[PDB]
Amino acid sequence: AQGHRLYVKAKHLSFQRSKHVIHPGTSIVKIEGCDSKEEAQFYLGKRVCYVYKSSKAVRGSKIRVIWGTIARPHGNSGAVRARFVHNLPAKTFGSSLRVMLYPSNI
Amino acid sequence: FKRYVEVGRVVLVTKGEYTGKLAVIVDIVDHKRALIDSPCSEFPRQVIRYGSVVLTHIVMKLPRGARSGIVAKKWKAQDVCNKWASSAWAKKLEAKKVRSQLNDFDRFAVMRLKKQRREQVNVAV
């Protein structure tokens, strides 16, 4: 089944936050394989999605997606800042996100 | 022991802008800094810290504080180039660099040949 997955695995770590104030509009995403802020420049502007399933079979489907884009790197270790169309729920801390390769400049 | 910080021992630079370039210690400034030089023109004579290099098993006899040109003469005389390359350590490094240069079409070709190689599966009963 290794003829698929055009995307890259990622994890939703947290929102942008200070010690005591959280900003849910921007989320901190750890793209796996990206290990520094210079490698995070490749994934800037790429589409990222959160894919989950819900009980109702609305649209005749069991899966729904929240889309987003990668805006800028966060820190030195390769984490990025992502803004989603809808703010990611706080329950999705440590959940998985998919980073496509489009819009591609390669 | 096989690797001693010594005058004339060949080292491999693993940190900095000269990563992956062979060099030979010419003097010991201190226990934390060593003076190295390489015959190739891309490597200027410089003082580097011991934490930025790894120590190779090749020892080639140099006088203390030898100049750059005489280092090159000794390097060519003792054929350090193609002596380091003969060891499997350099072959593994060279293969890693070559494998990193492969493009998508080359990667597809490698998968085809390695599948042609794997279908061999001949083992004596």
Binding site: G78 | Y4, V5, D27, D30, Q46, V47, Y50, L55, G65
Partner: protein, 168 residues
């Protein structure tokens, strides 16, 4: 990093002093502004020459003529501490005068918990004779047979699969 500046200064000429004397010091500072301030402070406390009545006539950074040759530098320093009066002399082996002074500052700030303003250098000299070397550590570094293993090797990608070799 530190830079070695030679600073020449003199007092403003007046009717009493048609032509004044030139006073030159070689002092280390990260930038020229620090060197000029240190030069005036040294002049004020050595020659009692005020900055208001004085002016800097020249300043030039000095590069090490032989940065590719190992050398031994002896530094005479003055320590200002709780007592405020100490004379010390240290010997450092390196390739440039700047590195030795930086090493001295790191050593004293670590061991003695000093500061840049308190520490003042009377002189830095190059020990060109092995017999002139006083410290035993530097004498070892000049022995004919430097032979020691690699120290402090210590060598994201967390969760390494195999145990490290951390050896030859």
């Amino acid at each position: 990093a530190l830079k070695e500046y030679q600073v020449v200064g003199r007092k403003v000429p007046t009717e009493h002093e048609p032509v004044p004397k030139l006073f030159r010091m070689r002092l280390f500072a990260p930038n020229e502004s620090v060197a000029k301030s240190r030069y005036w402070y040294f002049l004020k406390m050595i020659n009692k020459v005020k900055k208001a009545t004085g002016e800097i006539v020249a300043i030039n950074e000095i590069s090490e003529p032989k940065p590719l040759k190992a050398k031994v530098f002896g530094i005479w320093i003055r320590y200002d501490s709780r007592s405020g009066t100490h004379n010390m002399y240290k010997e450092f082996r390196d390739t440039t005068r700047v590195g030795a002074v930086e090493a001295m500052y790191a050593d004293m700030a670590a061991r003695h918990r000093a500061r840049f303003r308190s520490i003042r250098i009377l002189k830095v000299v190059e020990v060109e004779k092995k017999e002139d070397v006083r410290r035993n550590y530097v004498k070892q570094l000049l022995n004919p047979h430097l032979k020691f293993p690699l120290p402090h090797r210590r060598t994201k990608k967390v969760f390494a699969p195999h145990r490290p070799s951390t050896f030859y």
